[PDB]
Structure formats: structure tokens, C-alpha cells
């Protein structure tokens, strides 16, 4: 499903407004993208389904550190 493997972002629901404030139910989905991340330690490419916000944290946190949390999370990368 539409779940970020790094940040855990999932679809959320909200309202479409209008000039008359009429509210209709809608969904907000993450900006998910399948990317092949280069992991130096294994000299391999591992593909992850990440959001655009998740991509930013990978540079800041390091590719190895996030995967370590993923193994703790049991996400089965």
C-alpha cells in the first residue's frame, strides 16, 4: 500500500472546501517514489518506496543508519 518505508507516511483524509465552504471528503496521499539507493557497505543497490520528505532525511541520517532502524522495525526492505 501507499506507505513510506522510511517515515511511515500514509494516506490521510480531509475536506475539499469552496467559496461556499461546502465540505466534501477527500484523501491526501504522500509523494511516494520508488528509488534505488546505493548502500556502500554491501556495494549494492536496494530499492525503497520513499516519499519526497523521506529522500531528504536519507541524506541527513545516512543510508546505513536508516536501514538499521528498518531492520529494528522489521519492514523487510
Amino acid at each position: 500500500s501507499r506507505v513510506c518505508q522510511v517515515t511511515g507516511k500514509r494516506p490521510v483524509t480531509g475536506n475539499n472546501r469552496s467559496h461556499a465552504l461546502n465540505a466534501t471528503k477527500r484523501r491526501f496521499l504522500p509523494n511516494l517514489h520508488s528509488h534505488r539507493f546505493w548502500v556502500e557497505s554491501e556495494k549494492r543497490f536496494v530499492t525503497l518506496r520513499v516519499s519526497a520528505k523521506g529522500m531528504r532525511v536519507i541524506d541527513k541520517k545516512g543510508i546505513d543508519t536508516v536501514l538499521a532502524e528498518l531492520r529494528a522495525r522489521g519492514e523487510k526492505y
Binding site: 546505493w38 543497490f45 529522500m55 541524506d59 545516512g62
Partner: protein
């Protein structure tokens, strides 16, 4: 996306130069090909250590350069036994090989490659100034003489 260079990628600079660059460049090309590394605390310090370590190598070599220099610069004149010139004209040329052997016996080892015979090839007999390019830039100066055989 700060990242530390590992080579001279295009115009980005040379090995060891943190520079701000668009994310995509390194996020998928520079790093997965190994041309550079992300500028992180651990990595940057190691590279800065590598920077200062090569600086110490430069220091040490140039330090030992002045060592050889002084060793032989201050006087330390040597003379070689060349077939009696007989009223002048020496019976042979004094080449880099022969002159290097002379200083080497004195102790200050010098390879003929380094030797640079200025303004001649030591043709006459008697005293004749010389020079040695001890380092890549440092210039020296030695007096060398010739006598009987």
C-alpha cells in the same frame, strides 16, 4: 547537499573540497560511482586528517631537504684525482657520475640526476664552482677542485 570530493569531477574542484551542489548530482551519480563522498562529520574529519598528513609529508621532505643542503653547502669542498692536466688541459671530462661519487665518499649522498653542472661540463683543471638541486626548488653551492692522478 554538501559532499567531499574524491577526485577532480568536472569543475567542482579536486580531491577534498566541500562544496554546495544540487542534491541530484551526488544523490544518484557522484556517490554511487564513488567519485565523491557526502560531507559528514566522520568523513570530513578523516579527510581533513589526510589533508594535514600530506602536509606533514611535505614538511618532512622539505625539512630533510635543508638537511642534505647544509650538510654539504657549508664548505665541504672535495677534490678528485684526474689524470694530470699537464700545463693545463685536463685529460678527461668530469661528468655527473664521477662528481656524485666524490660527494658520496664525503658522506653527503647525491645521485647524478640531482647534480646540475652550471655553465659547463667541468672541462678545465683546478677549482670550479658547482651546484646541487637538493630539493625541487632549494639550490645549493659547493666548491670542487682537481689535482694530480
Amino acid at each position: 547537499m554538501q559532499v567531499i570530493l574524491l577526485d577532480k569531477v568536472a569543475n567542482l574542484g579536486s580531491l577534498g573540497d566541500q562544496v554546495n551542489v544540487k542534491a541530484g548530482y551526488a544523490r544518484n551519480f557522484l556517490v554511487p560511482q564513488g567519485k565523491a563522498v557526502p560531507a559528514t562529520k566522520k568523513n570530513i574529519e578523516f579527510f581533513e586528517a589526510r589533508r594535514a598528513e600530506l602536509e606533514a609529508k611535505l614538511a618532512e621532505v622539505l625539512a630533510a631537504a635543508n638537511a642534505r643542503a647544509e650538510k654539504i653547502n657549508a664548505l665541504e669542498t672535495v677534490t678528485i684525482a684526474s689524470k694530470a692536466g699537464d700545463e693545463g688541459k685536463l685529460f678527461g671530462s668530469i661528468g655527473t657520475r664521477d662528481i656524485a661519487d666524490a660527494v658520496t665518499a664525503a658522506g653527503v649522498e647525491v645521485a647524478k640526476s640531482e647534480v646540475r653542472l652550471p655553465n659547463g661540463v667541468l672541462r678545465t683543471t683546478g677549482e670550479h664552482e658547482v651546484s646541487f638541486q637538493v630539493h625541487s626548488e632549494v639550490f645549493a653551492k659547493v666548491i670542487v677542485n682537481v689535482v694530480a692522478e
